[PDB]
Amino acid sequence: MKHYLICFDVQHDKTRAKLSRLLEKYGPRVQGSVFEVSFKTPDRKRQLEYKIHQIIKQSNTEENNIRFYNLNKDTIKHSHDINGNPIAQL
Amino acid sequence: MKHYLICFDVQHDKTRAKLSRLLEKYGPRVQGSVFEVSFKTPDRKRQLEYKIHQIIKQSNTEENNIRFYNLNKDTIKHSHDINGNPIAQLPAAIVL
Amino acid sequence: KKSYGQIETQGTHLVLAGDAQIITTDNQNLIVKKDDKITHKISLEQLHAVTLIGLHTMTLPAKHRLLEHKIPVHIADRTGRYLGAVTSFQPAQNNYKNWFIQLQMCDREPFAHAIAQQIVISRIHNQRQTLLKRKAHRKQLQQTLSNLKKLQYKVTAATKRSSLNGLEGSATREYFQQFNLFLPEWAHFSKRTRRPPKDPFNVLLSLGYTILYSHTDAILQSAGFITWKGIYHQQSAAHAALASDIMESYRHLVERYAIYIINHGQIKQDDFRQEKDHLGQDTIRLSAEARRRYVGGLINRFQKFSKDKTLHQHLYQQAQQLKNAMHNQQSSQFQVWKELK
Amino acid sequence: QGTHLVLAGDAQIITTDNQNLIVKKDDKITHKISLEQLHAVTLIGLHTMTLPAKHRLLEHKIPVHIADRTGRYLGAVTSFQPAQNNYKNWFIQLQMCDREPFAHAIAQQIVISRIHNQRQTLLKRKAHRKQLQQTLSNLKKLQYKVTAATKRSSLNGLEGSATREYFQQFNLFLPEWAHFSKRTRRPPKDPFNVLLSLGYTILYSHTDAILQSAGFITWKGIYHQQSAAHAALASDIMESYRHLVERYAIYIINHGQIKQDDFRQEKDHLGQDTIRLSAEARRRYVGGLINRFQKFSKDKTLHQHLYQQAQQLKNAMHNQQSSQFQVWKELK
Amino acid sequence: MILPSFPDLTGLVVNLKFTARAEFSLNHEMAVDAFLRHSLNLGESYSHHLSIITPENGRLFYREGDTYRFVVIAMGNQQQTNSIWHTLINHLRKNIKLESLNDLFDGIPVSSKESLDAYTLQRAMEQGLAWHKAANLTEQPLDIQWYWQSTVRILHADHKQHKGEQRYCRDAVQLTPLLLLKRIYETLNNVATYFNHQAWLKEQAQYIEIQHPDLYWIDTPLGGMAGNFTLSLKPGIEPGLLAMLILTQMVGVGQRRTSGLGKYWLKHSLKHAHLILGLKPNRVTRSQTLLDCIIQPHIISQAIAEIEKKTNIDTLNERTLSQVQSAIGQLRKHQYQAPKLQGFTIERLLAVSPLYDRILQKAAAIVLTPGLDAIMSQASYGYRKGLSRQQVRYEIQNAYRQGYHWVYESDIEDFFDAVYRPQLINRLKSLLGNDPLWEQIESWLGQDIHIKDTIIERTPNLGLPQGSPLSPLLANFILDDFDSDLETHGFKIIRFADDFIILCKSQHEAQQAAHAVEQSLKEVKLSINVEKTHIIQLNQGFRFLGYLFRTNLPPWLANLGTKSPQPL
């Protein structure tokens, strides 16, 4: 049981379109290119990264501009919006 | 001290430019439009928030998709990219 | 910019032991340029202290910014002897409470005597222990150890604070006279020469002590203390008395690393540079690369303290314990380190 | 001791010859002091300091006291021995700033000196003496009452009456356009209050920095209220020297270096109407006032004089005697 | 040439005494209209010849010994309505007594009434053209302010589309200068035609402008709109338009002017050469002014009984009563001059006036309360005492849907430092009519505090003094005018049960205003202690006025920012 934050900036729109459509199911699209993902067992993380490798091989660009961050139970507590609204609460 | 990462998505072509020109001072432009910042006293965070609000008033469209995600020590410890490289890491003592 | 571990609660401790850096400011960041080449752009929100060993510059607006944010900076020279510090005398939030408490409590005679007795007993026990882990020279080192025991046997019976200086001086003398047995012949010495270090071995000690002192001083000043007034060190020469008082127990980590470096061939006599300085005095120093290697190794050995706690996270604990000893007016709460039997 | 060198001008450059300290301004040597006769350095503003100079000073145990452009005191490049003076006299000040015989003796002397100096200011005109004989006799009568008043509020009333009787007469000196009548307003509406306000702020800041450098706690005052938003001791000691600003302001307006053109009428962001001084005129006035500070005496400048006064007050507190501290009175 | 003919207006001012305890509504044109209809019994022709001006409005509870004044205006040539009116009105003794009758134009009393003065059309043209001659610089804005008589009913572009009660004008945007001039021409042409190229010309010659409107909707238990606006005149206008303005000052504009609705008055710019034309401002005015009602003894005794609970009296009371009686004599003499404030410690330091002036202010508040309460109940900016709980929760949830996620504790105190007084005085002058009390009101609100030989002033024409009795009454009377200034900054107020609640999107401007105020107060204290300043002018921060001694954001933002909000 781990929360993660998924962010990217891939240059070509069609190449990152498959990234976006793959990542819709795993977590909500919280912002333009940012995803909130919840995992139960690391094997799902491994297979998701394997598919991300598949599409970045498809792009033939070698984009390492995919970044995963963690979101702990109290890291959520101090997280918010500009208007003070709490965010990423489950 | 508290470590935050600021992620914003604004469509006004000039307002996005002005936020880009503001936030590069406090922390590195780590991503295309995602920055990492650090503060020691929360009043310094409030000052930055007020500057951001002042800039986004000129949009006249009221954009509000600007998020401050916290980052802990163990949260940074578990974070990585796909390659396995640890990310958002900070040094304890630089021996320049 | 070889980093050395994960950031602490208070921040990162920048060091400049290199060659001829020039610190400048951004009003938000600290930029280190060597020959118009940028080497670092550290933010002022993460900086904790800074040490300047060598011939490093600091522009005056940078001094204004580091004096506003109350960030200490300590200075030294290429030989390694200490020079001074750029510190401010206004308290944290203008609350003069803890400073007044400390200045009252440090000159009380029974309290200060108890803590000075603890520090001296810790230092002599640590010295006896470090002379005890060299098996192959045990026959050469029996009598000396017994004599140190006798000196320790009198430290409990010392009834005035004026006798502790003499007892610790005699202990340190009989301790340092025994390093001629371990060290090679080219690095022999008989006396700790402090202000002008004039031996190959003494430069190592006088360059490690300032890193150790800067660490404990930055920790103490972040705790809330005023480091200039001391308990056991009344009259000092350019060292802040309280930092140079607490680091007494922890200064076998610099007299063991030096032996390890000299013996195991990491530093050999081809590194030392000898000159005459400013009037003509035989001064031995380290070139820039040997200084960087020595300081980096020392900080690395600081990080690998006893497990679950680095040295910074042990010194902050001991500072809190000392503060609680002084506020409650009990000398028994503060416990000296006293390395394991 | 020795010379306590103070740099409060504009961008001097400090260099060392390894046996002397040389301060040059536009490559003209302004100071050259041996390191055995130097006791401290005070840097008010931006002054470049060559690195051998800093190392030579730190090796000789000579503190360098660093202060901001306005005059705020930040800190000092020191070591153990020069920094023992910044805290070895904190407790005795807090003791001796509350004991009423001592504090009231000093607060009597300060007001005596203030009224004496503001008599001397009118004595030096020598062109409207006949209109001012009455005012000078009145000020003498008010001064003689300070020797007996045994409370603080009486001192406040006497000093307030003396100050009103001193400012009631400046309409004879100033020209037609600069004539001012009503007391000073926090948002100014007349030029002369603006000039006085700039002068008072500059003098207060510099007095504060020089008091802090000597080892004092400047919020514990002997005659004013211990409070935030200002330093009590700095606004306390600066009263004896307030006549310099007033004399200089009269001089500037009379000799024509500032005319009616330089003042600008405007409304602030708060919307309240103000009249202020233009940027060129403000820079000119501040430079001239610092020049008058530097022309205090042939031997000492004003900052060295205030350091000597702070040392005298320190000795007076240390030995408990309340009359070893003699105040500046502008004796001819 | 604009009007080739017009009837000869004539008038009577009748002053009558009350012998009984009588109570009116807030607008008096209905009762007086019914009085004349049940008295004269003329039938249809009363609509064609007569009209009513009632100077007294907004005074609800009358009393014995109080008079009443109103004006009757008649139109036509060789009418005998005034004759039978005189004969019937002379014997009107109970209820209603009679004091006197005065001719409107000559000013002589009603006796010798063979023929009255005739406001001939040529006289209207003269009193307009000479005014134009004496007021034309051709480079002047010539602003004149327009006050209503609390009701008018006009049609915005005569819209048939809206089809109902919505068909009338009820806000500033529906006020069109061409629409007003067209309605004026319609009424004047109707009156002339009872006894075309032209309508084209008046379309071109519109140069006038409507500035700073304050108009709103009042629904009489009917409908009407009430308020004032600054009508501004450009130089190209000819005296012909002015003649229409001045004649319509008496004839009227709007629907159903027979019931007296749809008249106005206009107060020209000051410092003009004294030229009084048509109707005189000192004739059509309340017979017993407001200040006489202030100085009536039983109201003063009532005020003394009201204030004495938190009086904290410390001095002799016979001197207080002699002082209030002497001040009553001075007010009747029209020579009073208010005392300046004094700052007393309670802990917190509060600045209050001496107690007798406080008594006079409480008396004025007691007098003014019923009319203002009745006008707040009957108007659009009205408190809703009986709140529909489902509707109120629905409004809160709708505002949450808008984005207003934070609420504040509601206190009127926070809005004492932002009130702009001339708007308030203009609104009162429109409701209760021209009166000599209003000047006095300003002199009570704009005083200066004395603390330890320091004069703390306030910015001119801004603010209401805390710790005064008129302030809580007059603050929420004109609270609605802040709505736009709350709209730009993302604030909303919801009113219910003589109360309200504050809703906001975010809390950053409040904290910046609070931090700006704190810094300003610290600098003011520093410049007290250093530069020996003696007159201090504060714009904001009076609540922390004790602190001194022991871009611009509006001043209510700081007072909100001193609090900590709550989410819903």
Author numbering:
A (entry chain A): 1 to 90
B (entry chain B): 1 to 96
C (entry chain E): 641 to 981
D (entry chain D): 650 to 981
E (entry chain C): 1 to 94, 111 to 211, 222 to 247, 258 to 382, 389 to 592, 617 to 634
The authors write:
In some CRISPR systems, a reverse transcriptase (RT) fusion to the Cas1 integrase and Cas6 maturase creates a single protein that enables concerted sequence integration and crRNA production. In this work, we determine the 3.7 Å resolution structure of a naturally occurring Thiomicrospira Cas6-RT-Cas1—Cas2 complex using single particle cryo-electron microscopy (cryo-EM) and investigate its activities in vitro to elucidate how RT activity might coordinate with the CRISPR integrase and with the Cas6 maturation nuclease in the context of a Cas6-RT-Cas1 fusion protein. As observed for previous CRISPR integrase structures, the Cas6-RT-Cas1—Cas2 complex is heterohexameric, consisting of a central Cas2 dimer and two distal Cas6-RT-Cas1 dimers. In this study, we identify a type III Thiomicrospira Cas6-RT-Cas1—Cas2 complex containing three active sites for CRISPR spacer integration, reverse transcription, and RNA processing, and we observe all three activities in our reconstituted system.
Approximately half of the complex displayed relatively lower local resolution, and refinement using a mask that excluded this region generated a reconstruction at 3.4 Å resolution with improved interpretability of high-resolution features. A model corresponding to two Cas2 chains and portions of four Cas6-RT-Cas1 chains was de novo built and refined into the higher resolution masked partial complex reconstruction. The Cas1 and Cas2 domains largely resemble those of the E. coli Cas1–Cas2 complex; however, there are some notable differences. When compared to the E. coli Cas1—Cas2 complex structure, the C-terminal α-helical domains of a given Cas1 are very similar (2.3 Å RMSD), while the linker and N-terminal β-sheet domains are offset by ~5–7 Å. Each Cas2 protomer has a ferredoxin-like fold, as observed in previous Cas2 structures. Additionally, the C-terminal segment (comprising amino acids 88–96) interacts with Cas1b rather than with Cas1b’ as in the E. coli Cas1—Cas2 structure. We found a cluster of residues (R832, R834, R835, and H879) adjacent to the active site that undergoes a large conformational change between Cas1a and Cas1b. In the non-catalytic Cas1b domains, these residues appear to coordinate an unknown density, potentially corresponding to a metal ion or water molecule. In the catalytic Cas1a domains, this density is not observed and the residues of interest are pushed away from each other, seemingly to accommodate the insertion of an α-helix from the RT domain.
